[PDB]
């Protein structure tokens, strides 16, 4: 029973940590454009199909190796995906593309109980990303874990709004207000990182890569043991929920001040403690090709009282400390450029604990 | 400027490939015993001074001829040592002995920049092994290359620990732990294969045939342009570093799972990718008179994306392929018996590239 995790905070025992090796800039297609900050469009336009800066990747490798050493020191068993060249171009009957990377296990794998679930993904450059984790998953399967792969999409043109106003306009907010994004409801699609666990209740957000059909698939597949709730936030470019609403303990959540939850009162009524972290201090000149500065709150809980947090983000370190939570500081400044913090770079496989309800 | 090579992976242009002709079983002296697996001691005891099985040598000749054809096909210029009868007994004022062979250019020649260096060797049966390569070296010299011969040892009794517990005991590990082997620090000695190149940094291991004095000689001779680092591994019978820690690209290394490096964190901190190859599939009944089954990882890089690998070792072929490295499969099963794989059987003379640092 190697696999067993019901939430984001029980005592961590086993985890999968991604790899920065051979990461490739994804081709600049509509869904990629819908996520890139204008600032990087020229980079994507010129670099697509090529590896991310090798000098930069090398620093990310060292940072993640250190993070793994600390995890082992903290008593956690660490697994790593297989090294793969992400530059290989593949062709399905629906499209052609080069790959991205396997840096973010959280984007593709979610563990609910004793079941490991492979998300379908929504990006053409991430269609074959599961290939890096199969050696690990088959081992868990042989050892008794349940293994599920959500329906892999065709990712044909119909899945995308080829005429999305990506070009800056921000009324994406209105569309967002309507639940209207770059991905249509043509077929189910989702990144696992758009789901966050709190025992019997899982919270999901409809985002640029996770559609209602995808959420309904998760809901139908997990019922009746788990309830999947849809929540929304003031956010014109969502992709993943863990740098917006990160649950760090039973009834305790970190809520991004810039992305307030429309259903916050549901949690206040449940007697939950909503904490708004201080702002990130990461330099504006440091390249964050895939996300926002909010990776600072993308922490990983080793247990209720131990949090792995970024070495450079002192203000948020202080916050945890005043709360009596021990801070394990690790520097992943360069790994951040690939699009993730601690929660994104990992996938908790086994946390010591039981299935409970925290919403009463 | 025929000679010019700074690492193990730049685009290969010229190479020297050894010969299996007239190879002789070396006399069974202490340094030979310290390298032979118990299984072969009777062979060495009865065959010493005689040619290796002629029927076996003939298959090795054919395999290496084919390997040379493929090298030419791959655009590489191939040079071969002069044919010599290795059975001739010679006598220095310090000892008497018959020779071995000139099958392994990597054991005696190392190219650093535009300089070709002849290692001193540490085996009495390899004292005059340089004679097979002089026609080639003089030609390069006439053409402008630098030529260096490290101090040839007397190889008197004082160079050897005549009371080394070779007879199986494995605490050779403790001695090994102390940097204590069959060769003393009486005078400098080394095989060039105990050094592996990565531009401005060269890594060396103190082994059964390479002593600290020998390493210090290389360090002093190459400074200040090159830095020679000493690294060690969990290995009770080292002789050569290329079937233990084979560097295959800038910041990429193949590390033998059975012989972990004590200084691995130095490389993880440099952001290097450490790959552990799958186990060899070579039959236990096939005679490997001079080494271990690990010849499988003793690959030769034609360039960063092309590797010459053994035809029979499918698992490691697959590994390179998932990494996007094209595999050039050649069968050298019988040549393996002489003690080497592709890296050992060759000496890269010219690789298209410049002197760089890869350790930052």
Contact A85 B268 (CB under 8 A): no
Rounded to the nearest angstrom, the minimum Cα separation between A150 and chain B is: 25
CA B312 to chain centre: 21
What is d(CA B237, CA B164) in angstroms, rounded to the nearest whole number?
12
Match 């874990």 to its residue by tokens: A145
Q: Helix, strand, or coil here: B139?
A: helix
Tell whether A132 lies on the interface with B, counting CB pairs under 8 A. no
* φ, ψ of residue B320 in degrees (nearest 5): -65, -40
What does the longest C-alpha to C-alpha distance in chain A come to?
Answer: 55
A142-158 CB burial, b ≥16 within 10 A, e <16: eeebeeeebebbbbeee
* φ, ψ of residue B252 in degrees (nearest 5): -130, 130
What is d(CA A110, CA A346) in angstroms, rounded to the nearest whole number?
10
Tell whether A57 lies on the interface with B, counting CB pairs under 8 A. yes
Q: Which two tokens stand for residue A173?
A: 């907010």
Give the angle B75-B76-B82 at the CA atoms, nearest 5°. 145
Across-strand partners of A202? A197, A228
Secondary structure element (H or E) that encloses residue B347, with its range: strand B346-351
What is d(CA B277, CA B300) in angstroms, rounded to the nearest whole number?
15
In this complex, which of B273, B275, B323 lies closest to A61 when CB atoms are compared? B273
Which residues in chain B (311-340) have CB-CB distances under 8 A to chain A? 322-325
CA B152 to chain centre: 18
In this complex, which of A59, A82, A83 lies closest to B273 when CB atoms are compared? A83
Half-sphere exposure of A252 (CA within 13 A, CB side): 12
Q: Provide the sign of the torsion angle of the four alpha carbons B60, B66, B71, B74, taken in this order.
A: negative
- φ/ψ region of A164 (left if φ > 0, alpha if ψ in -120 to 50, else beta) reads beta
Which residues in chain B (271-300) have CB-CB distances under 8 A to chain A? 271-273, 275
Q: Which residues of A are annotated as a binding site for arginine?
A: 107, 242, 259, 291-292
Across-strand partners of A258? none
Q: Helix, strand, or coil here: A152?
A: coil
CA terminus-to-terminus distance, chain A: 28
Tell whether B267 lies on the interface with A, counting CB pairs under 8 A. no
Match 């990310």 to its residue by tokens: A60
The full DSSP string for B207-233 is: -SS--HHHHHHHHHHHTTTSEEEE--B
How far, in Å, are A103, A337, B317 from residue A63 at the CA level?
12, 12, 30
Match 């070009």 to its residue by tokens: A167
Q: Helix, strand, or coil here: B300?
A: strand
Rounded to the nearest angstrom, the minimum Cα separation between B272 and chain A is: 7
Contact A59 B251 (CB under 8 A): no
Match 């010459």 to its residue by tokens: B308
Q: Which two tokens stand for residue B81?
A: 């040592």
Contact B323 A62 (CB under 8 A): no
How far, in Å, are B71, B74, B77, B79 from residue B12 at the CA level?
10, 9, 9, 13
CB pairs under 8 A between A and B: 38
Contact B271 A83 (CB under 8 A): no
What is d(CA A339, CA A228) in angstroms, rounded to the nearest whole number?
26
> Listing from the earlier edge strand, what are the strands of the sheet with A77-79?
A77-79, A12-17, A346-351
Secondary structure element (H or E) that encloses residue A275, with its range: strand A273-275
What is d(CA B82, CA B85) in angstroms, rounded to the nearest whole number?
10
Nearest to B339 by CA among B295, B283, B307: B295
* φ, ψ of residue B280 in degrees (nearest 5): -65, 155
What is d(CA A25, CA B310) in angstroms, rounded to the nearest whole number?
33
Q: Which two tokens stand for residue B132?
A: 């097979």
Q: Which two tokens stand for residue B9?
A: 């992976």
Number of residues assigned to chain B: 360
CA B15 to chain centre: 14
Structural contact between residues B299 and B307, judged by C-beta atoms closer than 8 angstroms:
yes
Match 């084979």 to its residue by tokens: B246
What is d(CA A155, CA B304) in angstroms, rounded to the nearest whole number?
34
Structural contact between residues B129 and B152, judged by C-beta atoms closer than 8 angstroms:
no
In this complex, which of B251, B268, B322 lies closest to A65 when CB atoms are compared? B268
What is d(CA A118, CA B317) in angstroms, rounded to the nearest whole number?
28
Nearest to A240 by CA among A282, A209, A280, A216: A209
The full DSSP string for B327-353 is: EEEE--TTGGGGT--TTTTEEEEEES-
Match 């563990």 to its residue by tokens: A111
Contact A58 B251 (CB under 8 A): yes
How far, in Å, are A348, B184, B257, B291, B299 from residue B341 at the CA level?
42, 28, 18, 10, 7
Name the closest residue on chain B to residue A62, using Cα atoms: B271
Rounded to the nearest angstrom, the minimum Cα separation between A67 and chain B is: 11
Structural contact between residues B97 and B89, judged by C-beta atoms closer than 8 angstroms:
yes
Rounded to the nearest angstrom, the minimum Cα separation between B199 and chain A is: 16
What is d(CA B229, CA B237) in angstroms, rounded to the nearest whole number?
20
Structural contact between residues A97 and A125, judged by C-beta atoms closer than 8 angstroms:
yes
Structural contact between residues B205 and B233, judged by C-beta atoms closer than 8 angstroms:
yes
The residues of A annotated with a catalytic role in the active site are 191, 240, 344
What is d(CA B50, CA B44) in angstroms, rounded to the nearest whole number?
10
The full DSSP string for A102-142 is: B--HHHHEEEEBTEEEE---S-GGGTTGGGGTHHHHHHHHH
Across-strand partners of A303? A306
CA A200 to chain centre: 20
Q: Which two tokens stand for residue A81?
A: 């995906």
- φ/ψ region of B68 (left if φ > 0, alpha if ψ in -120 to 50, else beta) reads alpha
Structure letter (DSSP) for residue A286: S
Method: X-ray
Structural contact between residues A166 and A33, judged by C-beta atoms closer than 8 angstroms:
yes
Peptide bond just before A177 cis, omega within 30 deg: no
Q: Provide the sign of the torsion angle of the four alpha carbons A66, A71, A72, A78, taken in this order.
A: negative
Half-sphere exposure of B25 (CA within 13 A, CB side): 22
What is d(CA A140, CA A350) in angstroms, rounded to the nearest whole number?
11
What is d(CA B278, CA B166) in angstroms, rounded to the nearest whole number?
29
Q: Where are the beta strands (DSSP E) in B141-183?
A: 146-149
Cβ neighbours around B252 below 10 Å, total: 21
Contact B322 A61 (CB under 8 A): no
Give the angle B108-B112-B117 at the CA atoms, nearest 5°. 35
Q: Which two tokens stand for residue B13?
A: 């242009």
Contact B271 A58 (CB under 8 A): yes
- Catalytic residue of the set B10, B191, B201, B235: B191
Establish whether B131 is an annotated binding residue: no
- Catalytic residue of the set B10, B201, B240, B343: B240
Peptide bond just before B224 cis, omega within 30 deg: yes
Rounded to the nearest angstrom, the minimum Cα separation between A88 and chain B is: 7
Tell me, in Å, the resolution of the deposited structure.
2.3
Cβ neighbours around B331 below 10 Å, total: 16
Structure letter (DSSP) for residue B168: S
What is d(CA A74, CA A253) in angstroms, rounded to the nearest whole number?
23
Peptide bond just before B20 cis, omega within 30 deg: no
Q: Are strands B306-310 and B300-303 parallel, antiparallel or unpaired?
A: antiparallel
What is d(CA B118, CA B135) in angstroms, rounded to the nearest whole number?
13
Which of A62, A63, A82 is the mutation pick for testing B, counting most B CBs within 10 A?
A62
What is d(CA B264, CA B184) in angstroms, rounded to the nearest whole number?
27
Instruction: Indicate which CATH number applies to the domain containing B131.
Output: 3.75.10.10
Name the closest residue on chain B to residue A132, using Cα atoms: B322
Structural contact between residues A98 and A24, judged by C-beta atoms closer than 8 angstroms:
yes
Tell whether A70 lies on the interface with B, counting CB pairs under 8 A. no
Match 């007239």 to its residue by tokens: B22
Segments forming the whole domain that contains residue B66: 1-360
What does the longest C-alpha to C-alpha distance in chain B come to?
Answer: 55
SS (H, E, C) B274-296: EECCCCCCCCCCCCCCCCCHHHH
Q: Are strands B306-310 and B326-330 parallel, antiparallel or unpaired?
A: parallel
What is d(CA A90, CA A221) in angstroms, rounded to the nearest whole number?
30
Q: Which two tokens stand for residue B37?
A: 């697996």
Establish whether B225 is an annotated binding residue: no
Tell me the Cα Rg of chain A: 19
Rounded to the nearest angstrom, the minimum Cα separation between A203 and chain B is: 36
What is d(CA B203, CA B192) in angstroms, rounded to the nearest whole number?
11
Q: Are strands A346-351 and A12-17 parallel, antiparallel or unpaired?
A: antiparallel
Active site residue B344: yes
Structure letter (DSSP) for residue B4: B
Structural contact between residues B209 and B150, judged by C-beta atoms closer than 8 angstroms:
no
Q: Helix, strand, or coil here: B308?
A: strand
Half-sphere exposure of B308 (CA within 13 A, CB side): 27
In this complex, which of A57, A60, A85 lies closest to B323 when CB atoms are compared? A85
Contact A60 B271 (CB under 8 A): yes
In this complex, which of B251, B270, B324 lies closest to A85 when CB atoms are compared? B324
Alpha helices in chain A (DSSP H): 30-33, 41-47, 54-73, 105-108, 134-142, 172-178, 212-222, 264-269, 314-322
Secondary structure element (H or E) that encloses residue B314, with its range: helix B314-322
Secondary structure element (H or E) that encloses residue B177, with its range: helix B172-178
Match 């090298």 to its residue by tokens: B71
- The count of structural domains within chain A is 1
Contact B271 A84 (CB under 8 A): no
What is d(CA B240, CA B16) in angstroms, rounded to the nearest whole number?
18
């Amino acid at each position: 029973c190697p696999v067993s995790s019901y939430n984001e905070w029980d005592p961590l025992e086993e985890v999968i940590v991604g790899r920065a090796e051979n990461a490739c800039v994804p081709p600049f297609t509509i869904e990629v454009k819908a996520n890139t900050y204008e600032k990087y469009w020229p980079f994507y336009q010129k670099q697509g199909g090529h590896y991310f800066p090798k000098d930069h990747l090398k620093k990310a490798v060292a940072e993640i190796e250190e993070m793994c050493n600390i995890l082992k020191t903290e008593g956690v068993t660490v697994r790593r995906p297989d090294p793969i060249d992400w530059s290989l171009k593949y062709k399905t009957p629906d499209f052609e593309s080069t790959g991205l990377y396997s840096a973010m296990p959280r984007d593709i794998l979610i563990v609910v109980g004793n079941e490991i679930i492979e998300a379908p993904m929504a990006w053409r450059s991430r269609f074959f990303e599961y290939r890096a984790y199969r050696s690990i998953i088959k081992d868990y399967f042989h050892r008794g874990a349940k293994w599920t792969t959500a329906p892999k999409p065709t990712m044909a043109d119909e899945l995308y709004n080829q005429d999305y106003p990506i070009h800056s306009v921000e009324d994406r907010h209105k569309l967002a207000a309507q639940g209207k994004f770059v991905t249509t409801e043509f077929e189910p699609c989702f990144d696992a990182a758009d789901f966050i666990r709190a025992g019997r209740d899982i919270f999901a957000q409809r985002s640029q890569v996770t559609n209602y059909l995808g959420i309904e698939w998760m809901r139908r597949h997990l019922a009746p043991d788990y309830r999947v709730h849809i929540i929304s936030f003031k956010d014109p470019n969502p992709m993943h929920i863990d740098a917006t609403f990160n649950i760090i303990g039973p009834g305790i959540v970190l809520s991004n001040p810039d992305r307030p939850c429309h259903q916050i009162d549901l949690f206040k009524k449940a007697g939950w403690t909503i904490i708004t972290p201080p702002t990130p201090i990461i330099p504006d000149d440091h390249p964050l090709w895939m996300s926002s500065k909010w990776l600072s709150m993308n922490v990983l809980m080793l247990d209720e009282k131990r949090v792995m947090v970024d070495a450079n983000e002192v203000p948020i370190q202080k916050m945890f400390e005043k709360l009596g939570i021990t801070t394990i500081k690790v520097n992943i400044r360069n790994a951040n450029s690939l699009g993730g913090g601690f929660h994104c770079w990992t996938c908790d496989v086994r946390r010591r604990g039981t299935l409970q309800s925290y919403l009463d």
